[PDB]
């Protein structure tokens, strides 16, 4: 495993260990998002704003329907066969999304048999259930605003103001919509489109959608904020101006024999100067295989690191040896900033750079001094039952590692500069050194 | 200092000099954000949407309260002793934030003595002042929407529609809230959470919060947009569904003998080709020490660069020598983009790549020609009182540097490619060159 003692001497104090779990096995529910409100109760005070809105929304939704019927007409049952000659160019994800789209078309047709009922909806959330075959939920984009504000104010304000307000609400809805459903949606076939983005067709109210679908669980927020709950547009209507979206609700399957180890970057002292070690702060270990993880795209939770797909990335052999004990191969960067972490706590044991912070022991009153040959000091109850570092007073546990931690020095790694301009500078210097040697 | 003449010949025309100032010495005000509106005036038809909202909000807020009582029960007076054995794993910032939390608990209890008054609030902004001990402001998340829209429309619409509107408003509030207070808030103990993020518990209205607190000053916008005004959740109520937040309002102290120098990247000519210099455009010089600055996280203002943290990062010795005069160590990248800056103005003196743009002088009518051995041309009133650069006609001052600027050539640095794929390609080539040499 990782050599946590030498890493802590380097300033990589080990943190909490988190489970590795990935989105898997998605269950499908189909919903209807009607992108035009019902203005039947205020039709006499509507004007031509609805026709302009219909034209604009048709222009927006026509490319989406075209991209869908790229895969509708080129995919058929056989048990799902595509004419890849007609499709021409596609990726694996896009082809799998086309399979999912063709699988969803049967329920899309079952829903489209309720086209008139979808058109007749006059509430923001309407459940359509004629038989067990057709049990869909319809969400209307601006119906609540109509029924709450504009209809009660028909007799209170001049109806030209009502028309202007309806036009402004529709245009604001289109402004919020175009960030997601505009030309940014080049590939509506893909099912990686999250439910937050699709909720922009409902004014950004994904909470209403998912609470109505009945997804309230303890892992619901984890699936929500890890971008695991995604949806796919499976049908676009250019006459009634609604879309049918297949919402994919997955389960978080834990990756077995896998864990993410977090390292806390404590600055350490060397050569009368302060350094921080340039290592990955999160290390994914699966089947004792040490590798990097793109944890920026993953949700980090106290129990687990939650990802919507496997973000494991390769790691150099030099960093793997750094993490397994070869501290001489660990790059270090100078500390010019005065706000980088000076100390950290792990298992009740404090690892501090007491050159930079005034460590002193409350039990004895003596200052905890660090020598020039010590990168950090391990402070535990054997040497200091209660340590004080400025404004904090902390009681400490006992270190489970070597009792000679503070007397056992280690080899140190090469200095680095991680700024991208300085990265180009070092590449220039190494290239010129190679040319001089050659 | 920096050798601005050679840098300008390289195309790094010096810009404005800005002070370095950092957030320091925060003053604390405690506020209450009641996360559930008072629906008493429409209680006869709120339905069960309020109980569902309470269940959802309790599920959201329970992890936050648990994370707080991790540090409530493990911190006590000594004079603030913390039980590091029970906490186990923590960072310096997290421990300091827990100490600040325990410091704020006394005012949290003083406020919680007004629990019934907080529950009884029926306005979006309510000032609670029984005695001088308890002078807290309470902000209610959706109270204004209730009092303005739903209560007046009780008799105007069938208030089942009012129930639906209330449910939709609460769900939209939760949708806006979950981006900040959901599982993304893994560490609510930290006090680095900005007031913009906390205002999402008030619907994103941080202006109301900070105007009500009376933080109106000339530096208020600078503190706001530099993420210097931050708050810390100090108490969570799972029965009345409110939080007590300690808002930290700091002062922007100036870093003495420190300044950030901006360089304007003018493209320059060499070998019948156009180049830009790969140097940091902002250089932080503190006590004559030249270093990089992560200015992406800081607010840049005409007077100063404003930071919530010391974002100074180290600089390579080669780049420091580039900035101090060694132009042969300055990396340069080819120009393929036809939209990179061709010229710039500094102190009324124009530094232009007249190979790429048609420089000409209005005073004499003669075109300002650049030779193949010149990287740029310095255009000043000694050689051209008024220069023309197409649609731009500009009057120019006198250069304070060398009078032989245009006749004194310089050494040029190595070409580079800064694309990350090209970075991997150059690392591949240097590694293979090393293996061939070895």
């Amino acid at each position, epitope marked *: 495993i990782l050599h946590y003692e030498k890493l802590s001497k380097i300033g990589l104090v080990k943190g909490v260990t*988190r489970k590795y779990k990935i989105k898997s*096995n998605p269950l499908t529910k189909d919903i209807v998002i009607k992108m035009i409100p019902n203005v039947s109760n205020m039709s006499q005070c509507t004007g031509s704003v609805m026709e302009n809105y219909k034209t604009r929304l048709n222009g927006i939704l026509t490319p989406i329907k075209g991209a869908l019927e790229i895969y509708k007409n080129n995919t058929h049952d056989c048990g799902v066969c595509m004419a890849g000659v007609a499709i021409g160019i596609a990726t694996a994800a896009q082809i799998t999304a086309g399979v999912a789209l063709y699988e969803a078309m049967k329920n899309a047709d079952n829903i489209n048999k309720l086209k008139s009922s979808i058109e007749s909806t006059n509430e923001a959330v309407v459940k359509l259930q004629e038989t067990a075959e057709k049990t869909v939920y319809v969400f209307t984009a601006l119906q609540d605003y109509i029924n709450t504000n504009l209809v009660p104010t028909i007799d209170k304000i001049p109806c030209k103001q009502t028309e202007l307000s309806l036009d402004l609400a529709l245009s604001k809805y289109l402004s919020d919509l175009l960030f997601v459903f505009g030309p940014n949606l080049q590939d509506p076939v893909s099912n990686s489109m999250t439910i937050q983005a699709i909720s922009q067709a409902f004014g950004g109210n994904y909470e209403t959608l998912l609470r109505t679908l009945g997804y309230a669980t*303890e892992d619901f927020d984890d699936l929500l904020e890890s971008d695991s709950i995604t949806g796919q547009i499976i049908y676009v209507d250019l006459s009634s101006y609604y879309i049918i979206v297949r919402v994919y609700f997955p389960i978080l*399957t834990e990756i077995q024999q896998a864990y993410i180890q977090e390292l806390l970057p404590v600055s350490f002292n060397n050569d009368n100067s302060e350094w921080i070690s340039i290592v990955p702060n999160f290390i994914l270990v699966r089947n004792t295989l040490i590798s990097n993880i793109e944890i920026g795209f993953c949700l980090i939770t106290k*129990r687990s690191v939650i990802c919507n797909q496997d973000y494991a990335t390769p790691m150099t052999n030099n960093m793997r040896e750094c993490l397994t004990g070869s501290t001489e191969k660990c790059p270090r960067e100078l500390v010019v900033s005065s706000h980088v972490p000076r100390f950290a706590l792990s298992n009740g044991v404090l690892f501090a750079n007491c050159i930079s912070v005034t460590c002193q022991c409350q039990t004895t009153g003596r200052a905890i001094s660090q020598s020039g040959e010590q990168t950090l000091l391990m402070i535990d109850n054997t040497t200091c039952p209660t340590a004080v570092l400025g404004n904090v007073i902390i009681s400490l546990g006992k270190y489970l590692g070597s009792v000679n931690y503070n007397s056992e020095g280690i080899a140190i790694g090469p200095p680095v500069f991680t700024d991208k301009v300085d990265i180009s500078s070092q590449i220039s210097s190494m290239n010129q050194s190679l040319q001089q040697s050659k | 200092i920096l050798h601005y003449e050679k840098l300008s010949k390289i195309g790094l025309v010096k810009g404005v000099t800005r002070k370095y100032k950092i957030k320091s010495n925060p003053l604390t005000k405690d506020i209450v954000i009641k996360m559930i509106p008072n629906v008493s005036n429409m209680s006869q038809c709120t339905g069960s949407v309020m109980e569902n909202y309470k269940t959802r909000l309790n599920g959201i807020l329970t992890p936050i309260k*648990g994370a707080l009582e991790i540090y409530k029960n493990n911190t006590h007076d000594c004079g603030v002793c913390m039980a590091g054995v029970a906490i186990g794993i923590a960072t310096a910032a997290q421990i300091t934030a827990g100490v600040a939390l325990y410091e704020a608990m006394k005012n949290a209890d003083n406020i919680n003595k007004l629990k019934s008054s907080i529950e009884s609030t029926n306005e979006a902004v309510v000032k609670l002042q029984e005695t001088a001990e308890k002078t807290v402001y309470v902000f209610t998340a959706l109270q204004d929407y209730i009092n303005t829209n739903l209560v007046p429309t009780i008799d105007k619409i069938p208030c089942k529609q009012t129930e639906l509107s209330l449910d939709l408003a609460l769900s939209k509030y939760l949708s806006d809230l979950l981006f900040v207070f959901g599982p993304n808030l893994q560490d609510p103990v930290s006090n680095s959470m900005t007031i913009q993020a906390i205002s999402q518990a008030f619907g994103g209205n941080y202006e109301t919060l900070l105007r009500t607190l009376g933080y109106a000053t000339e530096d208020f916008d600078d503190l706001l947009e530099s993420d210097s005004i931050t708050g810390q959740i100090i108490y969570v109520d799972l029965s009345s569904y409110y939080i007590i937040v300690r808002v930290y309002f700091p002062i922007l102290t100036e870093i003495q003998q420190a300044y950030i120098q901006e360089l304007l990247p003018v493209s320059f000519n060499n070998d019948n080709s156009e180049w830009i210099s790969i140097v940091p455009n902002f250089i932080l010089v503190r006590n004559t020490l030249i270093s990089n600055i992560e200015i992406g996280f800081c607010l840049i203002t005409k007077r100063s660069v404003i930071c919530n943290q010391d974002y100074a990062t180290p600089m390579t010795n080669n780049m420091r020598e580039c900035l101090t005069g060694s132009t042969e160590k300055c990396p340069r990248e080819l120009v393929v983009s036809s939209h990179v800056p061709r010229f710039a103005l500094s102190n009324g003196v124009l530094f232009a790549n007249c190979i790429s743009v048609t420089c000409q002088c209005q005073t004499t009518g003669r075109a300002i020609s650049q030779s193949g051995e010149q990287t740029l041309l310095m255009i000043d009133n000694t050689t051209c009182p008024t220069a023309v650069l197409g649609n731009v006609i500009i009057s120019l001052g006198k250069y304070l540097g060398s009078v032989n600027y245009n006749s004194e050539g310089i050494a040029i640095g190595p070409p580079v490619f800064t694309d990350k794929v090209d970075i991997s390609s150059q690392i591949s080539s240097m590694n293979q060159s090393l293996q061939q040499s070895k």
Partner: antibody, heavy 116, light 107 residues
Framework: QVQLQQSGAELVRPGTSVKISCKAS????????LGWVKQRPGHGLEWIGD????????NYNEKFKGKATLTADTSSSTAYMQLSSLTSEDSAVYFC?????????WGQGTTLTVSS | DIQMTQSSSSFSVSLGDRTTITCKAS??????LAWFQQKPGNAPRLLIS???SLETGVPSRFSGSGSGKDYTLSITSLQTEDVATYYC?????????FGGGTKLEIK
């Protein structure tokens, strides 16, 4: 290798309280849920409550809320279940088990017998 | 609370024959199911996590499946070590509920 070592079987008089312990050892992950499950003869498994060794809160079954009290000691990784006002129907085998939704690793079980 | 009901308190299946244990939830739990095997005198051991995913130590003869409210644990070839009580646990809603327990027996 994960082991959840529980306290031995207890013979407790009615009306008094018992405090069953469960020391989790060998668990890789720092923060986890730890649930308590009751198993009576003639009855299925009955979940009592979950203690969260990560965030400082706990879930209780509404049947067992107030009856049971879950506490945890993060230093020794030992959690406790205080059962108060024991009666004859409280005699059961009690299992501590880490869970991630599903109960993953189970303790060997503490047989509690309430009789006079 | 989600009531978890198993088909029978006990089944008698001959050795080598396929054994089917079914569990019905009161409401849709969306594959948030677990299957546990408990021999007498021992703690339950996890067989299936989710509807279908096997535990790494479980033999491949244990197969989990299910949709909606109905779920099924299948033993393709019953052995003498599989004679135990099988419990279905739901972990969809906050009160975690187990099944009635299916005490498997040999004819």
């Amino acid at each position: 290798q994960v082991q959840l070592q529980q306290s031995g079987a207890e013979l407790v008089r009615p009306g008094t309280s018992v405090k069953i312990s469960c020391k989790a050892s060998g668990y890789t992950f720092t923060n986890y849920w730890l649930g308590w499950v009751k198993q009576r003869p003639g009855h299925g498994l009955e979940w009592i409550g979950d203690i969260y060794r990560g965030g400082g809160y706990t879930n209780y079954n509404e049947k067992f809320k107030g009856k049971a009290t879950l506490t945890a000691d993060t230093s020794s990784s030992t959690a406790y279940m205080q059962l108060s006002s024991l009666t004859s129907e409280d005699s059961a085998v009690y299992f501590c088990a880490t869970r991630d939704g599903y109960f993953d690793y189970w303790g060997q079980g503490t047989t509690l017998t309430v009789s006079s | 609370d989600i009531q978890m009901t198993q088909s029978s308190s006990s089944f008698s299946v001959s050795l080598g024959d396929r054994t089917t244990i079914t569990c019905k939830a009161s409401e849709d739990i969306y594959n948030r199911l677990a299957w546990f095997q408990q021999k007498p005198g021992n703690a339950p051991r996890l067989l299936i996590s989710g509807a279908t995913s096997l535990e790494t130590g479980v033999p491949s003869r244990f197969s989990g499946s299910g949709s909606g409210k109905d779920y099924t644990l299948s033993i393709t070839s019953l052995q003498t070590e599989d004679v135990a009580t099988y419990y279905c646990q739901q972990y969809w809603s906050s009160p975690w509920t187990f099944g009635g327990g299916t005490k498997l027996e040999i004819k």
